[PDB]
Amino acid sequence: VHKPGEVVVSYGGMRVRPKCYGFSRMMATMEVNPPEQRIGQCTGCHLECIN
Amino acid sequence: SNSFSDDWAGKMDRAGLGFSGCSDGCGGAACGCFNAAPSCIFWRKWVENPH
Amino acid sequence: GIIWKVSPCAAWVPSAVIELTMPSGEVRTFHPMSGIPTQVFKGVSVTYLGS
Amino acid sequence: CKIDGIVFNQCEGESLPQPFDVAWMDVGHSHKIIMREHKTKWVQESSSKDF
């Protein structure tokens, strides 16, 4: 039959046989993580001497 | 570079031949219009003289 | 015939012999050209340059 | 993080409308596998079924 031949997927140090190799569009979702944080705080400031 | 049909068709431009362009795209819940793929932004530059 | 296979590297850089121990218990051999920042691919990890 | 409702990595809240398109293969197990750094291989051999 007019076929290219068998498929084997080798993927990062592995050798794997695919039952069905294919590409297709899928329904997905995305997430977000809010940026920013804030700080303030009392500090002790004193002056022993001045020159 | 003279009309800019995006914002009110084409009229007198208070700039002297300012440029045009798209940009990188924000997309997601943060910018809020719920599409995954990014968004182009259009920009002007004026060379102006108040007094 | 008596066949010869040949390659013109035209260089010499130090390299070594490495055996590796995956935490699972796998042992896979390879020869890294660690004088050159080569990146050999296997499993999940990759070793690279030395002094 | 989330695909078709099936967990891929548990995360915080997620949006919805986004079509998604990556390659995939099946090896006889429940969870599908996707790839971006894969190398394929084409071999054809005389198999009585392939006639």
Distance CA B2, CA B19 (A): 9
One-letter amino acid for residue C3 of the chain: I
Phi, psi of A7 (to 5 degrees): -110, 145
- Resolution in angstroms comes to 4.5
Whether residues A12 and C28 touch (CB distance < 8 A) is answered with no
The answer to whether A and C touch (≥3 CB pairs < 8 Å) is yes
Q: Decide if A17 touches D, using CB distance below 8 A.
A: yes
State CA C1 to chain mean position distance: 32
Amino acid at D18: Q
| Rounded Cα–Cα distance for residues D16 and D2 (Å) | 10
- Technique used by the depositors: cryo-EM
CA distance D19 to B35: 10
CA dihedral (C35, C37, C39, C44) positive or negative: positive
Q: How many residues does chain A have?
A: 51
Q: CB–CB of A32 and B30 under 8 A?
A: yes
Q: Is A30 on the interface with B (CB under 8 A)?
A: yes
